[PDB]
Amino acid sequence: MEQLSKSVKDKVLLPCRYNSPHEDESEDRIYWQKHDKVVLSVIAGKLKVWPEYKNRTLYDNTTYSLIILGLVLSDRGTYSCVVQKKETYEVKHLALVKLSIKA
């Protein structure tokens, strides 16, 4: 569980911590989620950002990491980065990031 402390209005990069010789844009499905919400997905290399996060997030293609712009208090919490392969779903990678925020 990596932990980051930022302030309201900061931008932040949440590291997915994914790096293995089995990275494969074809099969790799990458998801960032927070609680019962999905932030974004990357399927076949194509990015899809959920409505709540459109215009306030970026994706770093190099590291599969999530960038959030203009933090607000409700952005606090645990985020997950998941790399899966659908065959049946199989998970290749799971990483958790705890974002703490104050004003």
Side-chain angles (χ1 to χ4, degrees), residues 1-2 14-24 27-33 59 63-66 79-86 89-97:
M1 178 83 65
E2 181 169 11
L14 308 189
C16 183
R17 302 294 178 198
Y18 180 45
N19 179 81
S20 293
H22 300 275
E23 293 180 26
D24 190 351
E27 68 167 24
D28 273 6
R29 308 159 85 100
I30 304 107
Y31 293 94
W32 277 93
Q33 310 182 61
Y59 178 71
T63 69
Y64 310 87
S65 305
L66 168 63
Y79 287 76
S80 65
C81 189
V82 175
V83 183
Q84 81 185 7
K85 151 189 161 292
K86 191 172 184 170
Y89 295 97
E90 304 300 343
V91 172
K92 314 178 65 179
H93 169 82
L94 170 57
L96 312 187
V97 179

Side-chain angles (χ1 to χ4, degrees), residues 4 10 34 81 87 101:
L4 299 176
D10 286 350
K34 187 192 180 288
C81 189
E87 186 169 342
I101 308 176

Side-chain angles (χ1 to χ4, degrees), residues 6 12-13 17 26 30 32 36 54-55:
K6 315 294 282 188
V12 66
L13 192 149
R17 302 294 178 198
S26 188
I30 304 107
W32 277 93
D36 52 15
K54 290 185 190 296
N55 304 327

